[PDB]
Enzyme design. Structure first.
Site, PDB file in Angstrom:
ATOM      1  N   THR A  40       6.015 -41.509 -11.029  1.00 22.59           N
ATOM      2  CA  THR A  40       5.876 -42.258  -9.744  1.00 22.59           C
ATOM      3  C   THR A  40       4.278 -42.038  -9.475  1.00 22.59           C
ATOM      4  O   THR A  40       3.896 -41.228  -9.865  1.00 22.59           O
ATOM      5  CB  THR A  40       6.038 -41.808  -8.285  1.00 22.59           C
ATOM      6  OG1 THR A  40       6.763 -40.610  -8.262  1.00 22.59           O
ATOM      7  CG2 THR A  40       7.826 -42.690  -8.988  1.00 22.59           C
ATOM      8  N   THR A  41       4.112 -42.207  -8.177  1.00 21.11           N
ATOM      9  CA  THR A  41       2.444 -41.729  -8.451  1.00 21.11           C
ATOM     10  C   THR A  41       2.777 -40.869  -6.188  1.00 21.11           C
ATOM     11  O   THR A  41       3.552 -41.422  -5.332  1.00 21.11           O
ATOM     12  CB  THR A  41       1.709 -42.805  -7.887  1.00 21.11           C
ATOM     13  OG1 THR A  41       1.434 -43.578  -8.910  1.00 21.11           O
ATOM     14  CG2 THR A  41       0.174 -42.899  -7.555  1.00 21.11           C
TER      15      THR A  41
END
EC number: 3.4.25.1
Lengths: 243, 197, 232, 127, 55, 242, 55, 216, 198, 202, 240
Positions: free
Chosen positions: J20-21
């Site tokens: 993810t970020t």
């Protein structure tokens, strides 16, 4: 180790002919060396701790003289006896509570903390290298399913749960007064618990108290965090009691 | 991650009847780049012995420091300075102490003996040593040994020979330095001078 | 002579150990406790030291369970009792994990006694000042054991220990039967506890626990009160 | 995080029936990634507790813990017999948990055991 | 010891710490669920020691 | 009377006392007097340092240490124990700074050292320390602070303290000062005057005054008093003696 | 008593058959034999959190 | 520092300069040591004897060993030969000489050939597979007559009346097998050894009752 | 496991002391987003240190060295660490860490001015150390060392302004080689002064 | 060679990352911490509370990061009880950095810490793989760290209102997540008055 | 009379707050022979008096060598002196190896005190029964230090220890104001005259019972014994 002293009285691991340990009893006698008294009362939805505060000198800093500690965010404490031993046991209790929380994923209960401290303290009674600590610990807190809780442990390693206990020089008189009050009635509010806790000490020591001569710590269901009352609130309670 | 790095150098030693000569170049390099043009590889141990080492630089520094510490320990314990043969034996033991992870250093020891004659010892990275009359080491040892073999002498002719050997070897080698240092060990002490290259 | 009464690892010239006798004397000065084995169950009864209104009933108990079918009561010191209870529970769990079946009473008694024996042979420690009574039910057959501070255990049919236990033992000898039942055994246990009692017995100053084929159960104060009213 | 842990070939210049079947090359490296981790779990756990306690509270706490451990671990049986380790377990906090060291390979029922005097001498450091 | 029914988070923590201790060599993916005083809970544990709470 | 119960630190008297700790506390009163006064914006120390012989240097066997960049320390009793405790305090301060990256608060340092001292009064393999000491510090966000630790292991905050042979007279002299409303420049002279008054010349041949403060003047640093100010304070004290 | 024992033994897992098995498996695969395998379970499992409990 | 001294187990936590999980602890002790001796653990050009030939046989009047230095004089009464790594041979045979001298000092009697060979084999067997390479023939005379053994780094230890190792091993071994005889005079034995070593393609030793001598 | 180069560090010697220039860039790999970080340390009044390589090891060494300096100045006996002592300690630490196959990935440049004589040293992760009139380590190590070497060979004695100009032009050439910010520190009789960023 | 050129182990590229970020942005009154979703999951909370006003987001191996977070929560709680004061974000960052640096050869862990304290206000620290400790105005980690860095750097300005910071973080996270995925983005605003969490979907 | 119970160990406090074993150990220093150490603006000098068991035995040596700039003198037991000397040598060697600098005398003596304090607090040990005189040279100039069995050290300008050293101390105190200007000569003479006050009035100093140790600005630590002492003894007076 430099050996063990000879006699039915001078060592921890030697039984008397009548079968009793005397160093433990002497450690019990060491509690009354400070000269102070503590009283803990449990209410319907609160728990209160009251103790004396003696500042003999005038060059002393009264802010640094205290006997109410804080173990976790929701557990209070009060110690009677030798100051250094009390502080050392407080540090040990803090470490044990943190370890329990890390290992099990939730906050330690009051009875579990008291049992852990008592189990540690029992080991000093069965070995020739270590000696008992001359202090007693009283804890207060709030359970989830059950309400307030008051616990006490002693240098021998024995712990129990009470409704209203006391410790110090005037333990017997405080116990009799609390027994009479509890037998009369027990349904108390927040105001009544503090009032009776103060009244017990006042009527036992025969002293008209002042706001700077006592310190109070409370735990309530609405705000389950340990809180130490201030001089203004103590004075308000004293004025209400006097009126 | 290679914990070994090769650095250039070239050392020489000639043993005489009452003298000993140790010479070396003064360049530090890593194959292509030039680190410094002034770094002698000859270290004085006592008043009658000199050691010259070339190879990986960090190992050389550590070896010299350990040797000096051991010399001080021996002097304190035995109330006298230790001789050349004892130094050679101790160095052999120190080198073999690391057989399974060796020092990447080539050593040559020169000095005087008890009777007052020249002595030269040559080692290997594991610890084997033997006494010789003249020895050449370093990177350019292979292309320098036959010249000495095909070519005892006095001090002046030996110095002349040493100068011509290094001037001939420097022009044909990529690791020789811009200066040459010669240490002379005799009965009156030790003296040294630098010759430009 | 007092020259051999101080150290634990010293034999008297008559071949006696004195500190162990003193530990036994410590055991014989605690609160009374009684155990009776009936035809289809075992009953354990004892006094309690609180005897006050400020005590909280949910805090500390003297009759405690080890497994679904094992329980015990003590007489002597309490701090020494807690550690032994914890060790017994751990040993029972280990046995169940290894053999996938509940531990028999005899094995548990043997292992607990073996643990207690270790403290009576080395200098620098003191023996346990407590004695234990263990009840169980295996293969449709009740058991009753007692373990000494020395590490020696016996199998009993009816016993008493604590304050004034010789009179309790002779009382039990006078009025014990081999074909009793659980209710009769409970009545006899209450009577032999009342023999050495000094005050007025209520449901708040004694503890009773039973063990039959269903399991080990600790009687509630209401049931104890009902039993007490039965015998008046 | 308690399970993650972080030139000794002497030459006799300082009995072959007693020791045998061992070479330096095989013991140079472990046979499994979990071997040293499992052999030294308790030591690593004690080291982690001592480190955190020393960093948070001070020098006194780890010293007191080590002193208690040493004092309580001196009243055991002689090494050729099996001990119970009651008070040490109480102090260490392992009196209510069961691991894989307790149910696997019971040390009280080991299949090998040496001479008494030899073990007592080895523990004292004489051999 | 504690005298009352346990909690789901305690079992989750014990399992997670065990599986992380043995470095994922003990292959056991589990689905854990239960109810306690706080309420119903459901978890998801993986062989390398990583848990995850989902409905 | 505690005869028979006073040979180890792990033995209780029949009335619940440990007598080895009491003897250790008694041992402190065998040395000269050191005082410390906390004022509005700093803390100043003063030690009456006896002279043994004229063959010693000026700075030999001092009794004022530099625990950290912002903490001072004054000792009384056995000197070797004082050096050991100073080393312990330095190590604690360094460890805290390395772990958390800022200067250690004075209360935390006092607690650490007090617990370390107390740990020695529990076992029979060691003996209690035989020295008392005081700590002082100042910072812009906290203000001046002063503490005392004794061989039993009890620490407290003070407005003015005194340890040594003649602590009673020193305390009586201190109790007549309004230290809450004065400044370090006005407290150095009072410290010197009290030290001179307390000193007894019949049983003590000669002494040298030793002073140092920490506060706003030194910008939160513990330093030795400059020589000229020491001379002025000594002259004022000698004049006030007459 | 065994003449080759100096210290008391301990418990837990045993890593005695690591290298032997490591070479034996390679040899058996080279010569093409079969060795016992480990039982596995792969049946699907699920769970959900309803109003006041777990299924 | 008296409480930490009582605990007879120095941990890195009790030392100075400790913070976090590590600290300035591994960077404190950086001295050169005081006194010890021990080989380093496992992780250039190493001199090895390649074009060398050796020869040795025993008969009535003693043991004769010849080679092409390449012979180690362990004792006045003991002799040895090197083959392979020079450093390993020199080091381990120096250790063997020290052990023999210790034995003689303790027991007031010279060690035997069998005991010396067994000691050398035991020392070199501990490092099997590490990388050592050496092959040695040990000659001597003791109360049981002449002795001759062959020891290498693989644990082999054998005894015989005729041995040969080197580049020209086959030819020389065949020659001295053809010309061997137990009841042989010293001069004929010298001639046989010289002829064998000549055909292999010169040193020569001779062990007697009271120590070895050099012939040429 | 993959390796990338480090930032460039420059140093020259002049009449009154030394000049050191360092790059403000974070790293040449995937850590290029950590811009505007300083790599120049002031040890004491007569020693400054520049680093090139891993940043965590640089911070660890910074902690250790600062603690050592504070410890030595607390005693107040009149003794302080010279640049050569710091050089030797760093060399020994690097060698000891390397011998255990757990090296400190750094390449330090040390400059100082004690007793009226300038100092300039070099230490890498393998324990190789020496002293030279000029040094250059990093991305353009081989493109800057010969230039400074020949410039100093032409004029053995250099002034402060000339050395600063030479450092500036070398950094400009290095940036022109591949396309921003840097900072400069100087040690002289006054002390250690750091100017930046530029 | 490796000597004069000062080669570096280059921790961030040891293995390819497809996670993810995570982003943290500082505004005037505090800090905003957010994470996106981008198999299963979509109902999982990616924000781990360390204290009452301190949070963190993890990148790398799940088990290693969870163990590190548990140990740090332990140590921070113990320290806060000991010193008797609310904790500082710098202390939590140092506690993370110690283990993230000592175990760099065993664990694959990357931590970002955001929080608020009464002494210095909202702060955000970055502890990527390798043990680096740097405070930043805005910190980016995860998978879009290379894709959105230029846009975030160009657009970012000085301290703005809480709502504007939340909008900016949401926009950056959405542009990072729609690279070509999921639909759930989680945000949390930390200020003196307390945390204020919200989830954006659809 | 009442002291018999509290003077058998170093872990027991007397009812007057005194440790009697430390005071007993401090009395072993007076069992040796006299030693004198003084210093000037440039040099540091140690002078010692040697005893012999009989006419057929060599005199015991008192002045030892620690490093190129540090030397010590011994008065008390012998095993403790040897152990302390080994510790000093090891510390100096390690410091020189690591930092390529000489170890300062102040740091060395602080290490000595820290090491010696330990056996006076724990059980099963006894204090070191030896007193030392240390002379060194570093960036701060000459130094003279004194060490005590009670783990106490002082920074002196002239000191004497041993048996009947009161006369030497009195002489040094009387002539203290002239030491800082004397060169090596007349400084060794002041030391010898101070040492001569510890002898009976009938006998004098010969070359077989005196040892001298000198360390200076550019002169390393050297020991003069037997015939090397005659030049210093040439100019002495006839014991006025």
């Amino acid at each position: 180790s430099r050996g063990s002293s000879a006699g039915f009285d001078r060592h921890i691991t030697i039984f008397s002919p009548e079968g009793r340990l005397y160093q433990v009893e002497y450690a019990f006698k060491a509690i009354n060396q400070g000269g102070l008294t503590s009283v803990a009362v449990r209410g319907k939805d609160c728990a209160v701790i009251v103790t004396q505060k003696k500042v003999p000198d005038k060059l002393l800093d009264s802010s640094t003289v205290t006997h109410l500690f804080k173990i976790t965010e929701n557990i209070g404490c009060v110690m009677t006896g030798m100051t250094a031993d009390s502080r050392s046991q407080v540090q040990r209790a803090r470490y044990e509570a943190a370890n329990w929380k890390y290992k099990y994923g939730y906050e330690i209960p009051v009875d579990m903390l008291c049992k852990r401290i008592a189990d540690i303290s029992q080991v000093y009674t069965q070995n020739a290298e270590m000696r008992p600590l001359g202090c007693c610990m009283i804890l207060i807190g709030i359970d989830e399913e059950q309400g307030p809780q008051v616990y006490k442990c002693d240098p021998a390693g024995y712990y129990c749960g009470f409704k209203a206990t006391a410790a110090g020089v005037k333990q017997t008189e405080s116990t009799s007064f609390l027994e009479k009050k509890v037998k009369k009635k027990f349904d108390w509010t927040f105001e009544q618990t503090v009032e009776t806790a103060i009244t017990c000490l006042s009527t036992v020591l025969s002293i008209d108290f002042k706001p700077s001569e006592i310190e109070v710590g409370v735990v309530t269901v609405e705000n389950p965090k340990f809180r130490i009352l201030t001089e203004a609130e103590i004075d308000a309670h004293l004025v209400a009691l006097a009126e | 991650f290679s914990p070994y790095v090769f650095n250039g150098g070239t050392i020489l030693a000639i043993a005489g009847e009452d003298f000993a000569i140790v010479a070396s170049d003064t360049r530090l390099s890593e194959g292509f780049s030039i680190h410094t043009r002034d770094s002698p590889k000859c270290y004085k141990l006592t008043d009658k012995t000199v050691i010259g080492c070339s190879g990986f630089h960090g190992d050389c520094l550590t070896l010299t420091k350990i040797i000096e510490a051991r010399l001080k320990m021996y002097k304190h314990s035995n109330n006298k300075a230790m001789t050349t043969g004892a130094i050679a034996a101790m160095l052999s033991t120190i080198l073999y102490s690391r057989r399974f992870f060796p020092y990447y250093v080539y050593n040559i020891i020169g000095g005087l003996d008890e009777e007052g004659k020249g002595a030269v010892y040559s080692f290997d990275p594991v610890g084997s040593y033997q006494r010789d009359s003249f020895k050449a080491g370093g990177s350019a040892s292979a292309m320098l040994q036959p010249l000495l073999d095909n070519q005892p002498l006095s001090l002046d002719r030996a110095m002349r020979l040493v100068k011509d050997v290094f001037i001939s070897a420097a022009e044909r080698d990529v690791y020789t330095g811009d200066a040459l240092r010669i240490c002379i060990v005799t009965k009156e002490g030790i003296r040294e001078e630098t010759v430009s290259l | 002579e007092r020259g051999y009464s101080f150290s634990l690892t010293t034999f008297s010239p008559s071949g006696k150990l004195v500190q162990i006798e003193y530990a036994l004397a410590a055991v014989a000065g605690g609160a009374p406790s009684v155990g009776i084995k009936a035809a289809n169950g075992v009953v354990l009864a004892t006094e309690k030291k609180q005897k006050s209104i400020l005590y909280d009933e949910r805090s500390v108990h003297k009759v405690e369970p080890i497994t679904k079918h094992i329980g015990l009561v003590y007489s002597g010191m309490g701090p020494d009792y807690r550690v032994l209870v914890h060790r017994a529970r751990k040993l029972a769990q280990q046995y169940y994990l290894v053999y996938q079946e509940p531990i028999p009473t005899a094995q548990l008694v043997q292992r607990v006694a073996s643990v207690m024996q270790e403290y009576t042979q080395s200098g620098g420690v003191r023996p346990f000042g407590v004695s234990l009574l263990i009840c169980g039910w295996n293969e449709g057959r009740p058991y009753l054991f007692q373990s000494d501070p020395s590490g020696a255990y016996f199998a009993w049919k009816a016993t008493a220990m604590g304050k004034n236990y010789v009179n309790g033992k002779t009382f039990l000898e006078k009025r014990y039967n081999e074909d009793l039942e659980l209710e009769d055994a409970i009545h006899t246990a209450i009577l032999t506890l009342k023999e050495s009692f000094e005050g007025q017995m209520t449901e708040d100053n004694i503890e009773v626990g039973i063990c039959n084929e269903a399991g080990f159960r600790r009687l509630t104060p209401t049931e104890v009160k009902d039993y007490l009213a039965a015998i008046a | 995080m308690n399970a993650r842990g972080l030139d000794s070939i002497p030459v006799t210049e300082l009995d072959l029936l007693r020791k045998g079947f061992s070479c330096v090359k095989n013991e140079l490296l472990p046979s499994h990634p979990l071997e040293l981790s499992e052999k030294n779990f308790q030591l690593n756990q004690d080291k982690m507790n001592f480190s955190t306690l020393r960093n948070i509270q001070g020098l006194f706490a780890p010293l007191k813990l080590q002193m208690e451990f040493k004092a309580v671990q001196q009243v055991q049986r002689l090494p050729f017999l099996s001990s119970s380790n009651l008070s040490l377990d109480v102090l260490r906090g392992n009196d209510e948990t069961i691991g894989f060291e307790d149910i696997l390979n019971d040390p009280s029922q080991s299949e090998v055991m040496g001479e008494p005097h030899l073990m007592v001498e080895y523990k004292l450091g004489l051999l | 010891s504690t005298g009352r029914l346990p909690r789901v988070v305690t079992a989750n923590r014990m399992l997670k710490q065990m599986l992380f201790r043995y470095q994922g060599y003990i292959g056991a993916a589990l689905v854990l669920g239960g109810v306690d005083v706080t309420g119903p809970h459901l978890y998801s544990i993986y062989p390398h020691g990583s848990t995850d709470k989902l409905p | 009377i505690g005869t028979g119960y006073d040979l180890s630190a792990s033995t209780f008297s029949p009335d619940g006392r440990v007598f080895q700790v009491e003897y250790a506390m008694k041992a402190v009163e065998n040395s000269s007097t050191a005082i410390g006064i906390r004022c509005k914006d700093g803390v100043v120390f003063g030690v009456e340092k006896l002279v043994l012989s004229k063959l010693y240097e000026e700075g030999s066997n001092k009794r004022l240490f530099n625990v950290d960049r912002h903490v001072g320390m004054a000792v009384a009793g056995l000197l070797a124990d004082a050096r050991s405790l100073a080393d312990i305090a330095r190590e604690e301060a360094s460890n805290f700074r390395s772990n958390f990256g800022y200067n250690i608060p004075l209360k935390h340092l006092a607690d650490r050292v007090a617990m370390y001292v107390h740990a020695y009064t529990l076992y029979s393999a060691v003996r209690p320390f035989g020295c008392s000491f005081m700590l002082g510090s100042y910072s812009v966000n906290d203000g001046a602070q002063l503490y005392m630790i004794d061989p039993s292991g009890v620490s407290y905050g003070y407005w003015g303290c005194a340890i040594g042979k003649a602590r009673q007279a020193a305390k009586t002299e201190i109790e007549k000062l309004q230290m809450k409303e004065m400044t370090c420049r006005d407290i150095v002279k009072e410290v010197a005057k009290i030290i001179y008054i307390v000193h007894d010349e019949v049983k003590d041949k000669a002494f040298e005054l030793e002073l140092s403060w920490v506060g706003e003047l030194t910008n939160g640093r513990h330093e030795i008093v400059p020589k000229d100010i020491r001379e002025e304070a000594e002259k004022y004290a000698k004049e006030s003696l007459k | 008593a065994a003449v080759s024992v100096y210290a008391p033994p301990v418990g837990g897992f045993s890593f005695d058959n690591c290298r032997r098995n490591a070479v034996l498996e390679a040899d058996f695969a080279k010569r093409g034999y079969k060795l016992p395998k480990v039982r596995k379970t792969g049946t699907t499992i699920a769970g959900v959190v309803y109003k006041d409990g777990i299924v | 520092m008296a409480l930490a001294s009582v605990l007879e187990r120095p941990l890195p936590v009790n030392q100075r300069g400790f913070f976090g999980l590590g600290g300035r602890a591994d960077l404190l002790d950086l001295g050169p040591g005081s006194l010890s001796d021990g080989l380093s653990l496992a992780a250039p050009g190493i001199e090895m004897l390649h074009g060398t030939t050796t020869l040795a046989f025993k008969f009535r009047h003693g043991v004769i060993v010849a080679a092409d230095k390449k012979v180690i004089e362990i004792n006045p009464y003991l002799l040895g030969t090197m083959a392979g790594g020079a450093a390993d041979c020199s080091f381990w045979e120096r250790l063997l000489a020290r052990q023999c001298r210790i034995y003689e000092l303790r027991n007031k009697e010279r060690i035997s050939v069998a005991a010396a060979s067994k000691l050398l084999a035991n020392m070199v067997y501990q490092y099997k597979g590490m990388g050592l390479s050496m092959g040695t023939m040990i000659c001597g005379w003791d109360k049981r007559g002449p002795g001759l053994y062959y020891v290498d780094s693989e644990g082999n230890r054998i005894s015989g009346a005729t041995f040969s190792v080197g580049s020209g091993s086959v030819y020389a071994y065949g020659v001295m097998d053809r010309g061997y005889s137990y009841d042989l005079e010293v001069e004929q034995a010298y001639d046989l050894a010289r002829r064998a070593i000549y055909q292999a393609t010169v040193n020569l030793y001779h062990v007697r009752e009271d120590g070895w001598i050099r012939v040429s | 496991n993959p390796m990338v180069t480090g930032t460039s560090v420059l140093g020259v010697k002049f009449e009154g002391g030394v000049v050191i220039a360092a790059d403000m860039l974070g790293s040449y790999g995937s850590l290029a987003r950590f811009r505007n970080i300083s790599r120049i340390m002031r040890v004491n009044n007569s020693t400054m240190l520049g680093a090139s390589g891993d940043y965590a090891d640089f911070q660890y060494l910074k902690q250790v060295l600062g603690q050592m300096v504070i410890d030595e100045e607390l005693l107040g006996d009149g003794h302080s660490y010279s640049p050569r002592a710091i050089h030797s300690w760093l060399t020994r630490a690097m060698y000891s860490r390397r011998s255990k196959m757990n090296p400190l990935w750094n390449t330090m440049v040390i400059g100082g001015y004690a007793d009226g004589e300038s100092f300039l040293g070099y230490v890498d992760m393998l324990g190789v150390a020496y002293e030279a009139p000029s040094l250059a380590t990093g991305y353009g190590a081989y493109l800057a060392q010969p230039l400074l070497r020949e410039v100093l060979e032409k004029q053995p004695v250099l002034s402060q302004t000339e050395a600063r100009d030479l450092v500036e032009r070398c950094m400009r050439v290095l940036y022109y080689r591949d396309a921003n910010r840097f900072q400069t520190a100087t040690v002289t009789e006054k002390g250690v002064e750091i100017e930046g960023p530029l | 060679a490796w000597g004069p050129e000062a080669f570096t182990p280059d921790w961030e590229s040891r293995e390819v990352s497809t996670g993810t970020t995570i982003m943290a942005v500082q505004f005037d009154g505090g800090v905003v911490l957010g994470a996106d979703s981008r198999i299963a999951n979509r109902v999982t909370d990616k924000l781990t509370p360390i204290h009452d006003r301190i949070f963190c987001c993890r990148s790398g191996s799940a088990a290693d990061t969870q163990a590190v977070a548990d140990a740090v929560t332990y140590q921070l709680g113990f320290h806060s009880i000991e010193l008797n004061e609310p904790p500082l974000v710098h202390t939590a960052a140092s506690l993370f950095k110690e283990m993230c640096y000592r175990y760099r050869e065993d664990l694959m862990a990357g931590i970002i810490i955001a929080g608020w304290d009464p002494q210095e206000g909202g702060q955000g620290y970055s502890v990527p793989m390798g043990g680096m400790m740097v405070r930043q105005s805005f910190a980016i980690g995860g998978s879009g760290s290379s894709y959105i860095y230029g846009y975030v750097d160009a657009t970012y300005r000085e301290g703005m209102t809480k709502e504007e910071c939340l909008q900016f973080t949401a926009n950056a996270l959405a542009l990072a997540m729609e690279r070509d995925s999921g639909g759930v983005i989680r945000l949390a605003a930390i200020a003196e008055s307390g945390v204020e969490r919200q989830v954006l979907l659809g | 009379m009442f002291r018999n119970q509290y003077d058998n160990d170093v872990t027991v406090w007397s009812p007057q707050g005194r440790i009697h074993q430390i005071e007993y150990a401090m009395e072993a220093v007076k069992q040796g022979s006299a030693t004198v150490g003084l210093k000037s603006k440039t040099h540091a000098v140690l002078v010692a008096l040697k005893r012999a068991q009989s006419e057929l035995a060599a005199h015991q040596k008192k002045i030892l060598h620690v490093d190129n700039h540090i030397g010590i003198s011994i008065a008390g037991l012998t095993a403790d002196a040897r152990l302390l000397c080994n510790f000093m040598r090891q510390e100096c060697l390690d410091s020189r190896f690591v930092f390529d600098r000489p170890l300062p005398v102040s740091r060395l003596v602080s290490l000595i005190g820290s090491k010696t304090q330990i056996p006076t607090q724990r059980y099963g040990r006894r204090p070191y029964g030896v007193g030392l005189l240390i002379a060194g040279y570093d960036d701060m100039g000459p130094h003279i230090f004194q060490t005590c069995p009670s783990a106490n050290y002082f920074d002196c300008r002239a000191m004497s220890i041993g048996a009947r050293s009161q006369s030497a101390r009195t002489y040094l105190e009387r002539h203290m104001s002239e030491f800082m200007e004397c060169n090596l000569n007349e400084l060794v003479k002041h030391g010898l005259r101070a040492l001569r006050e510890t002898l009976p009035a009938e006998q004098d100093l010969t070359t077989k019972n005196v040892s001298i140790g000198i360390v200076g600005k550019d002169l390393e630590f050297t020991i003069y014994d037997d015939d090397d002492v005659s030049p210093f003894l040439e100019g002495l007076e006839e014991r006025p």
